[PDB]
């Protein structure tokens, strides 16, 4: 679902 | 902030391209889905397609693809949205929609709705 | 491709009073991913309701969303004057997110 992947990217972001 | 600025109205041509401009300040940019939505002359709102900046992460709507494209310019945190084979059909009012953030305490965590608008930018397709 | 049906198509009545505003899709809306705007008259849309359920910071309390699966309903309890306008139900649970033609809300008179 191409309207979840920024919040792959911000999960990343804030993980590190 | 994030304010969203499109711009101005445009009279194409039938056959011609289009293509209009958003301008986001007050946010982050890079990160976040940047859609496309239209609505015609006394109809509803119809999304076009998407982008995340980032990668470009491209999302264009099945009834548009091959013949529209959309771009950002992180550099310049500008989206681009380009619309060819132009009929009177697409005459319209396109709009520049940035997803909102959980908690504007403030920007940071999407949340995939719209939360955020242009101005909205008239495009008249005739002859 | 999902289908947003929205009904009434045009509700009429009284302010102060409560509307409820019918969204049911074709499909099953995965993780409830479902958005309520509100357009006034000559303005662009104003993002209500998210999740199906969850309101964003500087919308009123007066709307709140409920359903799941594939029945959403917008609600609010005690209309203002400003709240006459037309309201757009957007389903974003797959890549291709779409609206549904949308419901006037009429002031009886």
């Known amino acids: 679902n191409w309207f979840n992947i920024t919040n792959x990217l911000w999960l990343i972001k804030k993980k590190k | 902030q994030v304010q969203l600025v499109q711009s101005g109205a445009e009279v194409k041509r039938p056959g011609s391209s289009v293509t209009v401009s958003c301008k986001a300040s007050?946010?982050?940019?890079?990160?976040?889905?940047l859609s496309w939505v239209r609505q015609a002359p006394g109809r509803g709102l119809e999304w076009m397609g998407g982008?995340?900046?980032?990668?470009?992460?491209?999302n264009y709507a099945p009834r548009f693809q091959g013949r529209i494209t959309i771009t950002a310019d992180r550099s310049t945190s500008t989206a681009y949205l380009e619309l060819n084979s132009l009929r009177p059909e697409d005459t319209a009012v396109y709009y520049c929609?940035?997803?909102?953030?959980?908690?504007?305490?403030?920007?940071?965590?999407?949340?995939?709705?719209?939360?955020?608008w242009g101005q909205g930018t008239l495009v008249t397709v005739s002859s | 491709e999902i289908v947003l049906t929205q009904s009434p198509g045009t509700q009429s009545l009284s302010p102060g009073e409560r509307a409820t505003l019918s969204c049911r899709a074709s499909?099953?809306?995965?993780?409830?991913?479902l958005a309520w705007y509100q357009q006034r008259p000559g303005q662009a849309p104003r993002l209500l309701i998210y999740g199906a359920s969850s309101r964003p910071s500087g919308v009123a309390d007066r709307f709140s969303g409920s359903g799941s699966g594939t029945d959403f309903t917008l609600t609010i309890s005690r209309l203002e004057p400003e709240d006459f306008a037309v309201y757009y139900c957007q389903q974003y649970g797959q890549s291709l997110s779409t609206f549904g033609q949308g419901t006037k809300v009429e002031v009886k008179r």
């Open positions: 499909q099953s809306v995965g993780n409830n991913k």
């Open positions: 007050g946010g982050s940019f890079s990160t976040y889905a």
């Open positions: 982008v995340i900046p980032l990668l470009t992460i491209t």
């Open positions: 929609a940035r997803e909102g953030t959980t908690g504007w305490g403030w920007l940071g965590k999407p949340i995939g709705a719209f939360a955020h």
